[PDB]
Amino acid sequence: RQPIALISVHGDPAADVGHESAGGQNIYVRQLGEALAAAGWHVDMFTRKTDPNDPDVIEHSPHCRTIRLQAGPLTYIPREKLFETLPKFVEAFKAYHAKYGYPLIHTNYWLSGWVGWQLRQQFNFQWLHTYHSLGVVKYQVASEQAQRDETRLMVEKAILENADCVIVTSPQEEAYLRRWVSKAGQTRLIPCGTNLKLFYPVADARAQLNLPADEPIVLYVGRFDRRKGIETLVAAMAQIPQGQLLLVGGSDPQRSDGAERRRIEGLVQEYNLGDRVTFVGQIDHEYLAVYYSAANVCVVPSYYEPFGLVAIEAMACGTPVIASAVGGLQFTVIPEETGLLVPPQDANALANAIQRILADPAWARTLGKNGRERVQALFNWEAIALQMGQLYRQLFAASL
Ligand SMILES: O=P(O)(O)OC[C@H]1O[C@@](CO)(O[C@H]2O[C@H](CO)[C@@H](O)[C@H](O)[C@H]2O)[C@@H](O)[C@@H]1O
Ligand SMILES: O=c1ccn([C@@H]2O[C@H](COP(=O)(O)OP(=O)(O)O)[C@@H](O)[C@H]2O)c(=O)[nH]1
């Protein structure tokens, strides 16, 4: 049985998701490696060790490990400073590569992509890469991310020019690569999926959450970042008379994605919205279906999203999604079949969008079931795993 190295440096697949350096990349590599181990592969998922009180090896499912390498300091470092920790990481990979001799390495970030680019000069292997965010789309915002990183753009160009395969999660991602990065390189459209056994209409959700069933609810699920546009959602909540906003997401006050940019609470006291904005905190990923099902609308008010995964998590639970028209959100959300699409930084358009589907609840209840069908059709992980597996089989078929 052949081995597989999955490299996700700041994304620990053994980590609970919902805070800084957590989220969709973590969920992506975790369910990918666990699905591949279910289909006859040996999977080692490589991440960075951030605490000596953490385990070195985490065995999730049979023949599926998470391996925390000692890259740099054994503390938390945000990814914008992890580049200097990368060559040591390379060395800490090589010992494992000395034992197993990985024929196939699938790197999942810029930083881990640089690690795979260093390994590509020394060893012969099938190298695949998923970006999970392009810096060239990141560094175009009138808000934050004008302070660029040309090292990131150089490496994100050098990955696409040299990797054997590049997994794009949306046709917008390939369009952004071909317009803004390079024309060379091989690419493959395999979109992100969700577990329909973990996301489903619960139909008992407000009784579990102790919420009044005749009161409207607007739902945000995601991280705390200026990228996510919670400012615009809170400003649009002031144009709606009834209804609470449940902000679900974790944060750490010692950290930047946390009480340095959980200033939304200040915006809660700006707009006099303390009676009708609830900060839920971090909810477990296997329990979010109750929050998605209890709500009348999930909002993804981002300023860019390379395949917003809470959109398909919400549509899987039968809840319509109002989202920005920026990235993979306009690949997931059909603007009149499953939800609505608004411009990013205007609260008036977002507020009129919420007004349309709070005033017509049966229309929201059929937008939600259409989102359920669309997720069952195109974004079911139980089929996307088979597509990924056949991709690995044909790439491993590159033999003598
Ligand atoms: O915002 P950045 O500094 O560019 O960091 C990228 C940010 O996005 C994460 C969340 O952990 O996930 C990305 O990839 C997943 C799946 O591919 C998407 O669902 C998600 O939309 C996308 O942001 C992660 O890479 C980083 O924190
Ligand atoms: O309390 C939370 C808050 C968020 N998430 C998950 O974190 C993931 C990240 O969502 P997304 O891809 O849309 O944004 P990202 O953070 O990955 O860029 C989603 O599956 C969310 O369900 C979670 O599990 N618990």
Residue numbers in the entry: 27 to 426
Sentences from the study reporting this entry:
SPS catalyzes sucrose-6-phosphate (S6P) synthesis by using UDP-glucose and fructose-6-phosphate. Thermosynechococcus elongatus SPS is a kind of sucrose-phosphate synthase (EC 2.4.1.14).
In the present study, we solved the co-crystal structure of Thermosynechococcus elongatus SPS (TeSPS) (Uniprot code: tll1590) with S6P and UDP. Therefore, we decided to soak the TeSPS:UDP co-crystals with S6P in an attempt to stabilze the structure further and increase resolution. In doing so, we were able to obtain a dataset at 3 Å resolution. The crystal structure of TeSPS (residues 27–426) showed that it is a GT-B type glycotransferase as a monomer. Overall, our resolved structure showed that TeSPS has 16 α helices and 14 β sheets, with UDP and S6P being bound at the interface of A- and B-domains.
